[PDB]
Design a protein around this ligand. Structure first.
Ligand SMILES: Cc1ccc2[nH]cc(C[C@H](N)C(=O)O)c2c1
Ligand SMILES: CC(C)=CCSP(=O)(O)OP(=O)(O)O
Length: 346
């Protein structure tokens, strides 16, 4: 029945998620299961009045909503729906934030019957006593038909200080058995995120993110080793100056070769466009050129907010091109909740 009112954070985001579930074509049962899961995952945040300031100035979204949606488009298919949440957001400092995030993961592990052993292995690296910013733990839920979601956990390589970012990432990869993966990463300006798949995997599967402050189309293509696709995507999303801030993501699904199995180019389109009309236009063009469901993109944006796209920027937060050995390319669009603020047109 939902103990939440549209004036509370959880009311707003569960309404958004519910409408997104319809775009994703999930039935009523799975929709109910997943909106409840989102409400539960926010903890006390769910009943917080939206009149109050965000408890934490999280990096998760620009207006500090501890929720963000993404839609993963494969050619010829309805998009798959995922949600990113910060379970410890309604806490007073980074240590408690991380304690509460871990507590949320453990409850998910219990409910859905997977092990946290590979996460537990890393706890001293990512949850020290006096953690540094900018976040402690996020969780992404892939909202799969059947009501049992895929779970991923995001961890901060800077948790023990900016000077220990590489040392912490390297030690984590070593402990997970990926002793050659670090050598496969491109040059970078930051290692902002480490993502670990949680589920039925007898060997760890990890995603290493790299920030590139001044990435060129050609460097994007070089790092993706497929190159033409990546450079074309760069221009279309970038709207092209010859460099842009972007992130690359490098997925390692085996501990044997030291080679990644996945490459993702993540482009923060919201930093390049005047307003969300321009950002939707670029995302829709990319989807159309790949045979993906560009009409569903429009319905998903309307499911999140009725506002006109040109009235702000940042609703389309990111567009990403995902390459995975053996699979079709995928395009992911990240969509903001705007529960606290709409950023004004640029
Ligand atoms: C690479 C990437 C792709 C999709 C994302 N959704 C939320 C974040 C975190 C933060 N808002 C940021 O922009 O880093 C993020 C990061
Ligand atoms: C949300 C954050 C921090 C990064 C982008 S989420 P992701 O790249 O892991 O998306 P998938 O692994 O493709 O599901």
């Amino acid at each position: 029945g939902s103990h939440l009112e549209p004036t509370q954070l959880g009311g707003l985001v569960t309404d958004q998620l519910a409408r997104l579930c319809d775009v994703a074509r999930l039935d009523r049962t799975d929709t109910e299961t997943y909106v409840q899961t989102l409400a539960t995952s926010l903890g006390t945040a769910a009943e917080r009045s939206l009149a109050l300031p965000p408890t934490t100035a999280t990096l998760l979204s620009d207006d500090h909503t501890p929720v963000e949606y993404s839609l993963a488009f494969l050619p010829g298919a309805t998009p798959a729906l995922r949600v990113l949440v910060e379970p410890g957001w309604d806490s007073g400092d980074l240590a408690e934030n991380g304690r509460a995030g871990l507590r949320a993961i453990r409850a998910m592990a219990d409910r859905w019957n997977f092990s946290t052993d590979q996460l537990d292995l890393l706890e001293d690296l990512f949850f020290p006593v006096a953690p540094a910013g900018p976040f402690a733990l996020w969780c992404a839920l892939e909202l799969r038909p059947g009501g049992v979601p895929g779970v991923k956990v995001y961890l901060n390589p800077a948790a023990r200080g900016r000077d220990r970012r590489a040392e912490t990432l390297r030690e984590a990869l070593d402990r997970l058995g990926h002793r050659q993966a670090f050598a496969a990463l491109p040059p970078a300006d930051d290692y902002p995120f480490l993502a670990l798949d949680l589920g039925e995997w007898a060997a760890p599967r990890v995603k290493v993110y790299c920030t590139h402050e001044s990435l060129s189309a050609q460097e994007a293509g070089e790092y993706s080793r497929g190159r033409d696709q990546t450079t074309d995507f760069f221009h279309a999303v970038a709207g092209t100056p010859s460099t842009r801030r972007a992130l690359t993501c490098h997925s390692f699904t085996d501990t044997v070769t030291g080679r990644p199995s996945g490459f993702t180019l993540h482009m923060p389109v919201r930093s390049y466009v005047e307003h969300d009309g321009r950002a939707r236009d670029r995302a829709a063009d990319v989807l159309r050129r790949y045979g993906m469901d560009n009409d569903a993109l429009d319905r998903a944006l309307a499911a999140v907010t009725p506002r006109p796209l040109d009235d702000g920027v940042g609703l389309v937060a990111y567009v990403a091109l995902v390459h995975q050995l053996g699979r079709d390319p995928r395009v992911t669009v990240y969509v903001s909740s705007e529960a606290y603020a709409v950023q004004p047109p640029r």
